[PDB]
Amino acid sequence: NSFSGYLKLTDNVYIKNADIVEEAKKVKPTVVVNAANVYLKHGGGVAGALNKATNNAMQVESDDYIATNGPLKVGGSCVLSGHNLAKHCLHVVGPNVNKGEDIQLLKSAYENFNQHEVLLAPLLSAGIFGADPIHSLRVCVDTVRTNVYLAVFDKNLYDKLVSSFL
């Protein structure tokens, strides 16, 4: 949890323009959040990048979790190993609003963060899931009560979020 270079947006939400893979390798936080789908198939976006950084160890562990427990629900989560990125990975499923999943479930998705005192995380449902990233930051701020360090890869997006929030 040796985070550096973050801007404090609220009492408990911090933001940095950084690649979450590189933040995780440098900080080795207690918890790194993955933006997952219900079958934990880490094919693209943040999920593909975190899985690639574990050289597919996260995918093999995830397939075993699904074979024993079944898929997650939208708005749900599970805690698995963080491998070389963190002590734990919290795999959280935000709604895929491009496939008709209700945006109201974005609040349920962020509620999972409250089970952990400190987390390194991306914006949920942004990117391939289709939600507006600034709306996702708003739900994060309105919902998460624990300390969250958000890593935003795209500089244009990061600047938009900081200008809209400060």
Ligand SMILES: O=C(O)[C@@H]1CCC[C@H]1c1ccc2nccnc2c1
């Ligand atoms: O922060 C961002 O710019 C977006 C917002 C939601 C998903 C974020 C993200 C971060 C790292 C990624 N690395 C490889 C591929 N896609 C990624 C996507």
